[PDB]
Design a protein around this ligand. Structure first.
Ligand SMILES: O=C(Nc1cc(Cl)ccc1O)C1CCNCC1
Ligand SMILES: O=C(Nc1cc(Cl)ccc1O)C1CCNCC1
Ligand SMILES: [Zn+2]
Length: 195
């Protein structure tokens, strides 16, 4: 089966936000609003903001999952390639097969779905710190889009879901991701191509 990617703000007005990082050749993570696409280097911090109109209940969680973007591949589980799943770069919490990790959250939980076999990582939501109006989650992508025997140059989407304590849907958003050596250049190129 294939997880839904339908944008759904839900009762709390859930949506993502991204920093404005620019397209300098030295940039490690940059987001294109025109393409709804994140470009990032391997295993580098990707800040993603979580916005709501009103505070959800205690016990609310936020889950990230990757799927292939192209319909002929959507049924295939997105996983790390045969090289990176064996390179012993574990943080002690993420299974070595998972593409997406959460950085710096000891309450992160990693799921291997007993039925779909798809991978995801989920963390508890906490309301914003004093003075701030949103929260930020830091993601890492642990394979290149180009990795042979893995994503193999196929585009992926990240689906972010806001869930209640049972895992029921409260909200959903998504963005395309390219994990690459030069995010600044590739963003500039793809935005030019779109023009
Ligand atoms: O669960 C806790 N806090 C909390 C979480 C959320 Cl989503 C909202 C309000 C809260 O007070 C502890
Ligand atoms: O509660 C809020 N945000 C928020 C809460 C949680 Cl649990 C997770 C991510 C968030 O962005 C704002 C606080 C200011 N008034 C509107 C609601
Ligand atoms: Zn790889």
């Amino acid at each position: 089966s294939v997880p839904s990617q339908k944008t759904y703000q839900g009762s709390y007005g859930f949506r993502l936000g991204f920093l404005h990082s620019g397209t300098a050749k030295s940039v490690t993570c940059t987001y294109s609003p025109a393409l709804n696409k994140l470009f990032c280097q391997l295993a580098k911090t990707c800040p993603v903001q979580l916005w709501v109109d009103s505070t959800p209940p205690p016990g609310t969680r936020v889950r990230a999952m990757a799927i292939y973007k192209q319909s002929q591949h959507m049924t295939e589980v997105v996983r790390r390639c045969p090289h990176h799943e064996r390179c012993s770069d574990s943080d002690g919490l993420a299974p070595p097969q998972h593409l997406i990790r959460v950085e710096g959250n000891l309450r992160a939980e990693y799921l291997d779905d007993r039925n779909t076999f798809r991978h995801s990582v989920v963390v508890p939501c906490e309301p914003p710190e004093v003075g701030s109006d949103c929260t930020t989650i830091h993601y890492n992508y642990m394979c290149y889009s180009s990795c042979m025997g893995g994503m193999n140059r196929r585009p992926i989407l990240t689906i972010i879901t806001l869930e209640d304590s049972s895992g029921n849907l409260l909200g959903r958003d998504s963005f395309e991701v390219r994990v690459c050596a030069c995010p600044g250049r590739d963003r500039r190129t793809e935005e030019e191509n779109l023009r």
